[PDB]
Each structure stands twice: as C-alpha cells, then as structure tokens.
Design a protein around this ligand. Structure first.
Ligand SMILES: *[C@@H]1O[C@H](CO)[C@@H](O[C@@H]2O[C@H](CO)[C@@H](O)[C@H](O)[C@H]2NC(C)=O)[C@H](O)[C@H]1NC(C)=O
Ligand SMILES: *[C@@H]1O[C@H](CO)[C@@H](O[C@@H]2O[C@H](CO)[C@@H](O)[C@H](O)[C@H]2NC(C)=O)[C@H](O)[C@H]1NC(C)=O
Ligand SMILES: [Ca+2]
Ligand SMILES: [Cl-]
Ligand SMILES: [Cl-]
Length: 331
C-alpha cells in the first residue's frame, strides 16, 4: 500500500511530477542489526565449560568452547540462516554463580528509525526466561523505556497484573504490559518463542483477520502515540532469570540453567514519514531515499531550496492514497 512516491504526467503546462504519500517495503530487520551482548564474559566458553543438553542426558558433558568453531556460541548465531536440523544459538555461561542472578542484556541497534509490522519473535533453546523485560529506544540508546514485561508471575516480579495484548481496547492499544504467557512454566513445555505481539495490537483496529486496514491506517494517522508505539531505533532484551522448569533450582546441577537464543526475528520497514519508498544502506546504516523535496535520514526535514513552509509528514489520509505533503520551493 502507499507504494509509489511520484508519477510523471502531463498537464498544461506540459510534463510534470505528481506526488503521493509513500513507504518502503517490509524487511528482515535482523539482516541489518548490530548486536551488543553484556555484561563482559556473559557468553559461554571462555574458559570452556560443560552444560546439560536436555537429554539430559543426566551426564551433562556437552561443552561450550569459545576457541573451537564447532563448540562456540557467539551473538551472531542469533541472526543467521539455519539449515534444517541445525539450530545455531548464542549461549550464556551456566548459572554456576547461583544464588547471584544470571542476567544478560542483548541490545539490538539499527542506528535508524524503523517501524515494526509483525511480531518480534525471540526463540530460546533451553528454556525461555522466567523473567525478562523488552525495552526500546527511539534516540539511538540515549534513553530507554520498557516495551513489554515478561514473568512467570507478573505481580511478584514487577508489581503488575498479568495481561495479554489481544485484551487491549482502542484506547489501550499502545499500553505497556506484563504478560505471563511466554514465561510461566518456562523450561518444561519446549515452546521456545517469546513474542512481542504487534499483529494483536493491529487487530484492535483491523479486526481479528486484519481485513479492516482502512481503520488501522486511519487510527495510525489520527491516534496520537499509536504509530510511534511501533517505532524504535533499538530494542534490548534485559534477561533477568533463566528457565526453572516450573520447579525450584536444583543446586547440585547448576549446569542445566543457561540462556540460549537461536533466532531473533524483527520485521518492519524504515520510518520515512510517508516520503520515500526505498530505504538502503548508505555509509554503513540504513537511510531513506527521500522524495517530495525532503532530506535527513528519515525525510524529516525540507531540502535547502524548498523551505517556504514548515515540514510535514506525508499522511495516510484521505483514503485510499493519502497526501504527500511535499516541501515547497518559493512561488
Ligand atoms: C542491563 O542494562 C541496564 C540499563 O543500562 C543496566 O542498568 C545499569 O545498572 C546499574 C545497576 O546494576 C546502575 O547503577 C546503572 O544506573 C544502570 N543504568 C541504567 C540506565 O539503568 C544493567 O546493569 C544491565 N544489566 C546487566 C546484567 O549488565
Ligand atoms: C549512524 O548513521 C548515520 C547515517 O544516517 C551515520 O552518519 C554518517 O556518518 C558518515 C561517516 O561517519 C558521515 O560521512 C555522514 O555525513 C554521516 N551522516 C549523518 C546524517 O550524520 C553514522 O555514522 C552512523 N552511526 C553509527 C554509530 O554507526
Ligand atoms: Ca541461529
Ligand atoms: Cl530526518
Ligand atoms: Cl540546514
């Protein structure tokens, strides 16, 4: 939708461009991400360390060794292409420091404003976390805010009630919530995925089958905060407690507790303020290819000779084609 920024047509005075509101295509945003995993030393394998392989097989004699490619689990394995039968994953050290918390931050950076268009799916291989917060930034990691909380027990963990995104109403579609859906029981079901529900929130407007896109586009234009809720320059997974298998920690086998993430899927498009339908790597980071006489990485300002009036974003409205709201040169 909103696929073309400009057309070359002929009116009298002859040939001229006509402009339309436009946006770039949805991308596999994990293919563009830069990752940081903290604190120092959290990645397994330096020094080599064994862990239990859910087999378990009671022995627990598998090894993570950062020095051997066959046995190493660096952060880039969270984003790779996987062939059938061969999940690859980042892996933390085991909880050998228990009762000290086992905590890891995974920061996902684009150095570019992007808009999610489907769920964020974070897939864990030996148990999802019992407690984690997904945070985002809109200013390249200068400030952070909570995006969704996750806990086996939302009250105990964060003083929050247990909710679900699909339970939110039109006025609460951008509300930050705590959910127990991906964390209560973690370690025992082998469900693997923790989600940040985007599609459920779009459904608040577009219906359960997402067929009423007209109403979602209208709300995205008009509801303050709605489009921004889906926008970010960075996400951070603040992992606070690993899977427990819905039972108490077995102190004599700390080798079964660890985080292992095989894939983080982030799907969405560059934010171009309805002024670009292409966004591409330039000077090492994504930037919109701005149309409508705009400029800046998100088409958020007017080009130097086109400053006769204030910059505006393009609009989705009126439906179906919206409005380009292009910058204007004098006269
Ligand atoms: C994960 O990221 C948060 C956010 O930066 C870290 O928070 C800092 O932690 C210490 C307490 O441990 C505070 O003194 C700082 O003020 C915190 N900064 C902020 C902005 O909150 C947290 O330490 C990180 N977790 C891990 C395990 O590294
Ligand atoms: C983040 O992205 C911006 C592009 O949007 C990069 O900014 C450019 O940096 C190059 C090389 O340093 C300069 O020649 C350009 O003039 C800069 N452009 C702008 C708009 O400032 C920036 O380096 C990237 N930052 C990081 C940390 O990767
Ligand atoms: Ca992988
Ligand atoms: Cl901009
Ligand atoms: Cl300027």
């Amino acid at each position: 939708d909103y696929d073309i920024c400009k057309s070359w047509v002929t009116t009298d005075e002859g040939p001229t461009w006509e402009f339309y509101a436009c946006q770039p295509k949805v991308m596999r945003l994990k293919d563009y991400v830069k990752v940081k995993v903290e604190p120092s030393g959290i990645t397994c394998g330096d020094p080599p360390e064994r862990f239990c392989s859910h087999e378990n097989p009671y022995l627990c004699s598998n090894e993570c060794d950062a020095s051997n490619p066959d046995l190493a689990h660096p952060p880039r394995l969270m984003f790779d292409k996987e062939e059938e039968g061969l999940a690859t994953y980042w892996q933390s050290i085991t909880w050998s420091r228990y009762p000290s918390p086992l905590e890891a931050n995974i920061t996902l950076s684009w150095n570019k404003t992007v808009e999610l268009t489907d769920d964020v799916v974070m897939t864990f291989e030996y148990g999802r976390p019992t407690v984690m917060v997904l945070e985002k930034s809109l200013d390249n990691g200068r400030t952070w805010q909570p995006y969704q909380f996750y806990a086996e027990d939302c009250m105990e963990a964060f003083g929050m009630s247990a909710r679900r995104a699909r339970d939110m109403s039109s006025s609460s579609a951008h509300r930050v919530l705590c959910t127990e859906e991906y964390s209560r029981w973690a370690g025992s079901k082998k469900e693997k995925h923790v989600r940040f529900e985007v599609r459920d929130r779009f459904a608040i407007f577009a219906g359960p089958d997402l067929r009423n896109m007209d109403n979602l586009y209208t709300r995205l234009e008009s509801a303050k905060g709605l489009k921004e809720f889906f926008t970010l320059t960075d996400l951070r997974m603040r992992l606070l407690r690993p899977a427990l298998g819905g039972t108490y920690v077995q102190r004599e086998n700390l080798y079964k507790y660890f985080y292992a993430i095989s894939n983080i899927e982030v799907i969405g498009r560059c934010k171009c303020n309805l002024h670009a339908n292409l966004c591409s790597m330039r000077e090492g980071s994504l930037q919109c290819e701005c149309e409508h006489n705009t400029t800046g990485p998100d088409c958020g300002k007017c080009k130097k000779n086109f400053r006769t009036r204030s910059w505006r974003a393009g609009s989705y409205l009126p439906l179906p084609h919206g409005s380009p709201n292009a910058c204007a040169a004098a006269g």
